[PDB]
Design a protein around this nucleic acid. Structure first.
Ligand SMILES: C=C[C@]1(C)C[C@@H](OC(=O)CS[C@H]2C[C@H]3CC[C@@H](C2)N3C)[C@]2(C)[C@H](C)CC[C@]3(CCC(=O)[C@H]32)[C@@H](C)[C@@H]1O
Ligand SMILES: [K+]
Ligand SMILES: [K+]
Ligand SMILES: [K+]
Ligand SMILES: [K+]
Ligand SMILES: [K+]
Ligand SMILES: [K+]
Ligand SMILES: [K+]
Ligand SMILES: [K+]
Ligand SMILES: [K+]
Ligand SMILES: [K+]
Ligand SMILES: [Mg+2]
Ligand SMILES: [Mg+2]
Ligand SMILES: [Mg+2]
Ligand SMILES: [Mg+2]
Ligand SMILES: [Mg+2]
Ligand SMILES: [Mg+2]
Ligand SMILES: [Mg+2]
Ligand SMILES: [Mg+2]
Ligand SMILES: [Mg+2]
Ligand SMILES: [Mg+2]
Ligand SMILES: [Mg+2]
Ligand SMILES: [Mg+2]
Ligand SMILES: [Mg+2]
Ligand SMILES: [Mg+2]
Ligand SMILES: [Mg+2]
Ligand SMILES: [Mg+2]
Ligand SMILES: [Mg+2]
Ligand SMILES: [Mg+2]
Ligand SMILES: [Mg+2]
Ligand SMILES: [Mg+2]
Ligand SMILES: [Mg+2]
Ligand SMILES: [Mg+2]
Ligand SMILES: [Mg+2]
Ligand SMILES: [Mg+2]
Ligand SMILES: [Mg+2]
Ligand SMILES: [Mg+2]
Ligand SMILES: [Mg+2]
Ligand SMILES: [Mg+2]
Ligand SMILES: [Zn+2]
Lengths: 208, 172, 38, 142
RNA sequence: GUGAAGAGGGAAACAACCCAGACCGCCAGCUAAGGUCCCAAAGUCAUGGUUAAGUGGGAAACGAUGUGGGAAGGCCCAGACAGCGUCGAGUCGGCCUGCGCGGAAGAU
RNA sequence: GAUGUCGGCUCAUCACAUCCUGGGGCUGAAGUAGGUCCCAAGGGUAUGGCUGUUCGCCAUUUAAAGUGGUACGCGAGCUGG
RNA sequence: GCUGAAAGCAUCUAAGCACGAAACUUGCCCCGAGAUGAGUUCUCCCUGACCCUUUAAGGGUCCUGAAGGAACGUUGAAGAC
């Protein structure tokens, strides 16, 4: 399994031998198990967890009853983690960042920062055409988008301008620099997706 | 045909158990078994082999069926032997249980886990002698061991079948 | 392996064999005689 | 007089269960297609679904002749350029064995709204069990 | 000869090919070419064969113990042919022919 | 009663008769490194000098600097030598 | 390649068995139930009267107005809207 945390921000750890390790600080508060999915009822094995602390007015009656069944406080959302062959968890169990104590590398999933409507230069690394040498109104425009009568259409997946970022991104195989269970902190080497404050899903590295 | 016509003699010791198409041959050296091709008739002394009706091949399938069960009879009775020789400076072999550990001039160990039914011993470092009931399996293991370092055509170095003539040619 | 439209026995030790719908010449004596029709 | 027409709101559709085990794919498919369309009924009407509900069991055990188990290829295009995908019969059986029968029958049913409606009455199962004991399907031998 | 100046049915689609020349109406019948497992009207028709290549459903010289049929030979229980005198039954490769096989690489 | 044209730029997309990388047979294959043929289309596959050039030659790289199809791909996308 | 007949031999193949590549199917990442074949799981909410006519998934009234949603406002490392 993994845990749900919050991107606090970035800093550095100076090592004794004079290396500065860039770190993303992830606040990993206790993940409370809200539901355990099994093969008989649900057709797959997973835990649903919550974290943080939502305010009663913002918790709907459907949400409240789900948390109340688990016997846990409402957190700011629900996330599932698929269970391994061995792994067992109970409803209402709290899972801390101590989970990651012996984990060397993590995959961190977040929602990337939103660039809104992005041109092909930004979105797809298209080359600009001539700034001068006669170019007419076509500096950052995409150029040709197809062939001719054959095929007489634009192909699906054509790289064009559109919404960029504000989407799920996983960065794989980030070194765990420090697990500070007392401060509810995980320090990972390097950048992770999303703005300060955003939800992060941290899992042990799939690749190894 | 001429293979299939010849009935396999049963030695004493080695009981036969036919059923359907699947035959079982059990003796001193284990209990082999085979499902024969559905175009084949076996008839217990002596297992006969001839063609079943409504089957174009027939005598082809009966000749193999014969040859297989001859080897199966001989396998549970006498057993089959294969010897590989190693050739090349610093090429050695040694068996630890059911794993042969071959040094074959690689930058790593080579450890072939011998399959069940096959026993192996190294009379010296440059010889393996496999022993088993299945002629097919012992041939397959021998081929697998040879394939690590096939005999090469200049100096004849590698894992060879002890029988094999390794044709050597000269360098240009 | 010689891949040819015309595959033939080149010596006494050459043998024509059909494997998987492909006419081949295998030779015990001479590896240069190994042929596949193709 | 005017020739009879079946009326969709009054059509009698019966439930059948067929075992695909060891049946030749195409020879089963034609009989399924016939009955899904209702060509076996005197009330057959081209513009009306007069056919029967058919449960097919043991779709994974459907047979093909020749080398078709390895050599029959199912092609589809994803709509994306270069997106021609292929699967052999044996791969289709391993992954999605119901699709073999369903694809065979779909190609033998009329094209258009009614042919799609006819196909909805076919219920293909990989194994020997179905959930439709409430519909009381009669054994149909093909 | 047809199209042009000709509809209808067949050849997926297809002026010029095949069948066939539309005065009008019919919710009758028989046929033509072409067809009769499902799309899709009609044989999952009958009898005897061939093919195993999805050949059928693209492609030549040429290559090959694929496989079927026919005629005729050589050698052979004075032991042939293959394997190692032994061994006990056929063997050998030309001919003609049917159907297949390789030869066979292209762009949404 | 108009189907805009060479070359460049931008953006491509497919084929495989494969340039590199992968697998393999033969070699007049000791090794290294080649030659040749077979399989393989996943990905990758120079920058400059000269010239409108494509190309080519030249300089210097690169694992490699593939060959073709796409209205000799692409001017209601740019350029206009 | 193994075993192995047809074809007493031989033969990787006909039966059977084993290897074998960046191609293929997965494994990795993202989308994804309009997957109309519209799936699953958990939780939450509403437990009134009444009369017609075309007695039917018929129609209307009186009362009721839930969960939740939307709207509005303050807004955002979300955003052309
Ligand atoms: C005017 C026609 C043009 C624009 C250009 C034409 O090129 C020529 O005709 C060459 S002669 C040349 C054309 C124009 C007009 C006068 C003068 C002479 N110039 C400036 C050219 C390249 C073809 C050879 C003939 C067909 C064309 C369509 C497709 C094509 O490639 C064109 C015509 C239909 C097109 O409209
Ligand atoms: K006429
Ligand atoms: K075909
Ligand atoms: K190109
Ligand atoms: K080579
Ligand atoms: K490639
Ligand atoms: K043109
Ligand atoms: K131009
Ligand atoms: K245009
Ligand atoms: K323009
Ligand atoms: K749904
Ligand atoms: Mg933004
Ligand atoms: Mg540029
Ligand atoms: Mg201007
Ligand atoms: Mg400008
Ligand atoms: Mg089109
Ligand atoms: Mg093969
Ligand atoms: Mg139609
Ligand atoms: Mg005229
Ligand atoms: Mg006409
Ligand atoms: Mg016509
Ligand atoms: Mg027509
Ligand atoms: Mg008639
Ligand atoms: Mg019909
Ligand atoms: Mg019949
Ligand atoms: Mg064909
Ligand atoms: Mg041919
Ligand atoms: Mg015009
Ligand atoms: Mg090729
Ligand atoms: Mg591909
Ligand atoms: Mg792959
Ligand atoms: Mg240049
Ligand atoms: Mg052009
Ligand atoms: Mg081009
Ligand atoms: Mg312009
Ligand atoms: Mg244009
Ligand atoms: Mg000019
Ligand atoms: Mg043999
Ligand atoms: Mg690589
Ligand atoms: Zn030879």
């Amino acid at each position: 399994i993994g845990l749900v945390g919050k991107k606090v921000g970035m800093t550095r750890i100076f090592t004794e031998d004079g290396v500065s390790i860039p770190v993303t600080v992830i606040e990993v508060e206790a993940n409370r198990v809200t539901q355990v999915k099994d093969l008989a009822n649900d057709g797959y094995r997973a835990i649903q967890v919550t974290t943080g602390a939502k305010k009663a007015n913002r918790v709907t009656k459907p949400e409240a009853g789900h948390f109340a069944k688990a016997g846990v406080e409402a957190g700011r959302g629900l996330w599932e983690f698929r269970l391994a062959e061995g792994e067992e968890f109970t409803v209402g169990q709290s899972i801390s960042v101590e989970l990651f104590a012996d984990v060397k590398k993590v995959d961190v999933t977040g929602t990337s920062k939103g660039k809104g409507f992005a041109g092909t230069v930004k979105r797809w690394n298209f080359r600009t055409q001539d700034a001068t040498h006669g170019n007419s109104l076509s500096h950052r425009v995409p150029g040709s988008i197809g062939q001719n009568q054959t095929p007489g259409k634009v192909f699906k997946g054509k790289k064009m301008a559109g919404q960029m970022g504000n989407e799920r991104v996983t960065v794989q195989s980030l070194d765990v620099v420090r697990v500070d269970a007392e401060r509810n902190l995980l320090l990972v080497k390097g950048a992770v997706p999303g703005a300060t404050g955003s939800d992060l899903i941290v899992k042990p590295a799939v690749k190894a | 045909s001429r293979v299939a016509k010849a009935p396999v003699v049963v030695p004493a010791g080695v009981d036969v158990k036919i059923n359907g198409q699947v035959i079982t041959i059990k003796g001193k050296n284990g209990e082999l078994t085979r499902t024969l091709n559905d175009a084949v008739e076996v008839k217990h002394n002596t297992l006969t082999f001839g063609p079943r009706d409504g089957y174009a091949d027939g005598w082809a399938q009966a000749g193999t069926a014969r040859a297989l069960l001859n080897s199966m009879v001989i396998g549970v009775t006498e057993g089959f032997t294969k010897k590989l020789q190693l050739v090349g400076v610093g090429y050695r072999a040694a068996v630890k249980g059911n794993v042969i550990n071959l040094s074959l001039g690689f930058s790593h160990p080579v450890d072939h886990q011998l399959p069940a039914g096959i026993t192996a011993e190294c009379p010296t470092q440059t010889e393996i002698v496999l022993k088993g009931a299945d002629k097919q399996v012992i041939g397959q293991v021998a081929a697998d061991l040879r394939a690590y370092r096939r005999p090469e055509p200049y100096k004849g170095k590698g894992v060879r079948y002890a029988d094999e003539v390794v044709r050597t040619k000269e360098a240009k | 392996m010689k891949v040819r439209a015309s595959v033939k026995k080149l010596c006494r030790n050459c043998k024509i064999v059909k494997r998987d719908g492909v006419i081949r010449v295998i030779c015990s004596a001479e590896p240069k005689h190994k042929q596949r029709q193709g | 007089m005017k020739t009879f027409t079946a009326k969709p709101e009054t059509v009698k559709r019966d439930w059948y269960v067929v075992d695909a085990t060891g049946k030749t794919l195409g020879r089963l498919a034609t009989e399924l297609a016939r009955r899904l369309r209702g060509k076996h009924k005197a009330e057959y009407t081209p513009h009306v679904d007069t056919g029967d509900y058919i449960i097919v069991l043991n779709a994974d055990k459907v047979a093909v002749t020749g080398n078709k188990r390895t050599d029959k290829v199912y092609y589809h295009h994803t709509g994306h350029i270069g997106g021609i995908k292929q699967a052999t019969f044996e791969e289709m059986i391993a992954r999605r064995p119901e699709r073999v029968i369903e694809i065979a029958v779909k190609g033998m049913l009329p094209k258009g709204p009614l042919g799609r409606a006819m196909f909805r009455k076919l219920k293909v199962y990989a194994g020997n069990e179905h959930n439709h004991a409430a519909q009381q399907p009669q054994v149909l031998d093909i």
